[PDB]
């Protein structure tokens, strides 16, 4: 009956907890207590990208590590030339409430989405000189929080309907759906593209197999909503920022939480997380108007980016690791080295 | 210094800047409103009778109207989950939140008060005023006059309540309905004035289904909100 099913679920959860606990051979902090600290990373702003009318929620670096796409709640995506600050493209949006943007790996497409529950793919390289809406993907029953491109024809999206979805582009239909008991806020794609991890408003991050379509693993530990998520460049680890003012690094193989990054002087939630190219530096944007650069192996705050007069909403590190670009609610993007 | 193609790219960026300035001239002069309420609340009727006078799973509905040559954009939410904690953060810069409450339903009035308390005390709406539309006043009047259900059965503080002296009863309407509607308004305003300091203010309004003045009250309240924002910004207080 229902009681029997509940008891079986409780027993399985206890078994999973015991199995995870029976593998804590040596904590990551204890092992890395011997490695040298990275020291104070005095990152400095080099270019200020301005021209957004309102606050920015999403930014994405191109594969070329030179072209940016930034989504602001003025109904606009802007494709920036990071090197020259020139505005390559200005795409008006038919829905002003945008929470995510994605720049296609090929550079041919950009993605946007928000409270209109539609993932809009815009074609950049057309015979006509204008950027045109390649198509609109509908089917989510909640706000679209993150979208990412597997390729020019597949896109994975996360919504507030406690659901992620992998979409085909030529046929705008959900190729598969991924079913979390709260709003899903962030997505991150593994470098192999065969998996993706999604954090939701239930203090739970789930690693999903893209092809099969079922939840491969689940990770708990946070005390509040998960707002940002990213992969370690290895593809076998991922870091989550949350409203409980903590970041947490998990490993899929260990199937348990590895390490936590927190300080008593910060009480604001993390809104955007990213990794440096090596994975040694974990950059996390906060509501305290700052972007804290942590040492991913020592949990020591190694740097602070303080150039924004409003909350840091989006943050991203280039493919080559040269620069880190963070966009805030003060209508500005800042590029740091 | 710059190659010819580089200068032409700079020129393209300058034209993009010019278009962005033209769009800023419109964004600055356009006021964004967030419509909130419940299924019982006639916010759909307000939207209909305010769009007339001035996609299946789509989560946002934008109603654009204009009063005294100033533009307003209400944004109703219609395809999102019962949770509100996150997408509400998208509206930290809106001019006002229009909160529509069905004053007739005594059973769900406490739910409306709790929802208004959640909106008022939210961290990201600490500087955002609420235009409170106590809709369905005619139904409340009919219910109180033809008295079968009593507020005292739901709020055990209606007996020890008197109509405030600073009241503006409509012509030819009984003191009982005035007492009821001002009690509801006083519950909402008590929640409003319990906290928030002076950053944001709740504007109460007794509205009906077919009222044609709702756009006018939104315009007046938004004018007051922008006045307060300018008093703060231009260093007058």
């Amino acid at each position, epitope marked *: 009956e229902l009681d029997q099913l509940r008891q079986e679920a409780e027993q399985l959860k206890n078994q999973i907890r015991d199995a995870r606990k029976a593998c804590a051979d040596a904590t990551l902090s204890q092992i890395t207590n011997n490695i040298d600290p990275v020291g104070r990373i005095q990152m400095r702003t080099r270019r200020t990208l301005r021209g957004h009318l309102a606050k920015i929620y999403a930014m994405h670096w191109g594969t070329d590590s*030179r*072209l940016l796409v930034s989504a602001s709640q003025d109904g606009k995506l802007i494709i920036w*030339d990071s090197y*020259t600050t*020139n505005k*390559v*493209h200005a795409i008006p949006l038919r829905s002003s409430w945008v929470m995510t943007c994605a720049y296609a790996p090929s*550079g041919n497409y950009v993605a946007c989405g928000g409270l209109d529950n539609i993932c809009s793919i815009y074609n950049l*390289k057309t*015979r*006509e*000189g*204008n950027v045109r809406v390649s198509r609109e993907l509908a089917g989510h029953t909640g706000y679209l929080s993150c979208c990412r491109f597997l390729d020019d024809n597949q896109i994975v999206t996360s919504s507030g309907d406690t659901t992620c979805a992998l979409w085909d582009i030529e046929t705008g239909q959900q190729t598969t759906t991924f079913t979390h008991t709260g709003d899903v806020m962030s997505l991150s794609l593994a470098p192999d593209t065969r998996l993706f991890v999604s954090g939701a408003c239930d203090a739970s991050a789930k690693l999903w197999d893209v092809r099969e379509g079922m939840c491969r693993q689940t990770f708990t530990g946070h005390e509040s909503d998960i707002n940002a998520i990213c992969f370690f460049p290895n593809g076998n680890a991922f870091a989550t920022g949350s409203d409980d003012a903590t970041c947490r690094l998990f490993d899929l193989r260990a199937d348990q939480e590895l390490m936590t990054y927190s300080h008593d002087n910060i009480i604001c939630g993390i809104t955007s997380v990213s990794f440096s190219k090596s994975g040694r530096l974990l950059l996390a944007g906060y509501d305290d108007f700052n972007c804290n650069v942590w040492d991913a192996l020592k949990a020591d705050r190694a740097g602070v980016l303080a150039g924004h007069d409003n909350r840091v909403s989006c943050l991203g590190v280039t493919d080559d690791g040269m620069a880190v670009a963070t966009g805030s609610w003060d209508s500005f993007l800042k590029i740091w080295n | 210094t710059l*190659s*010819a*193609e*580089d*200068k*032409a*790219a700079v*020129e*393209r960026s*300058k*034209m993009i800047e010019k278009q962005l300035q033209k769009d800023k001239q419109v964004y600055r002069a356009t006021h964004r409103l967030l419509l909130l309420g419940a299924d019982n609340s006639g916010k759909s009727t307000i939207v209909k009778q305010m769009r007339i006078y001035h996609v299946k799973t789509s989560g946002i509905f934008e109603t654009k109207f204009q009063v005294d040559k100033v533009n307003f954009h209400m944004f109703d939410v219609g395809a999102q989950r019962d949770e509100r904690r996150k997408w509400i953060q998208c509206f930290n810069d809106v001019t006002a939140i229009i909160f529509v409450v069905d004053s007739s339903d005594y059973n769900r009035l406490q739910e409306a008060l709790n929802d208004f308390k959640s909106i008022w005390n939210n961290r990201w709406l600490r500087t955002i005023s609420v235009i409170l539309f106590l809709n369905k006043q005619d139904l409340l009047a009919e219910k109180v006059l033809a008295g079968k259900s009593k507020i005292e059965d739901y709020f055990p503080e209606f007996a020890r309540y008197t109509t405030p002296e600073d009241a503006t009863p409509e012509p030819g309407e009984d003191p009982r309905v005035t007492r009821a509607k001002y009690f509801i308004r006083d519950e909402f305003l008590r929640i409003s004035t319990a906290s928030g300091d002076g950053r944001h203010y709740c504007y109460p309004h007794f509205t009906c289904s077919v009222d044609t003045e709702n756009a006018r009250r939104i315009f007046n309240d938004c004018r007051d909100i922008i006045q307060r924002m300018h008093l703060r910004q231009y260093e007058l207080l």
Partner: single-chain antibody
Amino acid sequence: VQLVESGGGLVQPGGSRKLSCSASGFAFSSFGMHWVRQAPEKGLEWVAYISSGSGTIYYADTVKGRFTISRDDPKNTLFLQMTSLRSEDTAMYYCVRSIYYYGSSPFDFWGQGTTLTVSDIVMTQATSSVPVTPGESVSISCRSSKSLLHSNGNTYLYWFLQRPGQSPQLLIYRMSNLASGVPDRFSGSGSTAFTLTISRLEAEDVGVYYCMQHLEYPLTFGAGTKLEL
């Protein structure tokens, strides 16, 4: 994308004539426009350029002052008004579409040309004719008087193919980048000295190959390398 041109013919020397260009099928307002002349048997020569927003207008030294360029974005029509016509101005005039942003392909689309008959970095193409047979691989070389590699890392060399009785078609922009719609057979490389390599040649690649610089105005072409079967 279509660029039709009109307004040419027989005109007595010393007169005037206006050339019009109707653009249909693309965002004309966001594209810069070029007028490029070609004498009846000689090569291509850049005449004028108008920028998006009409804020940057350049003329060749041989047409400056007596020619003026203009555009009408709402009507999507380019204009070249010419005064004091001379015997040198007997050519097919071409409208050229060129957008300028990072990664863009300038000179992507050429029009059809209008015949008008009246009654500076140097591009050298030391080879004017090449005997070729289908199936082989040929390389067309150009030389420049000044280095076209700018400090930004771009070598601003362009390649065009003019098939018999047809407008020039972009093949390679910036000396390495393939245009859209050209087969992967074409490939270009270089440094002051450049080359265009065609592999597994087909019968549709016969014509005259022109190399054009874009480092600084005036835009100067080469003589052209004719490939005949």
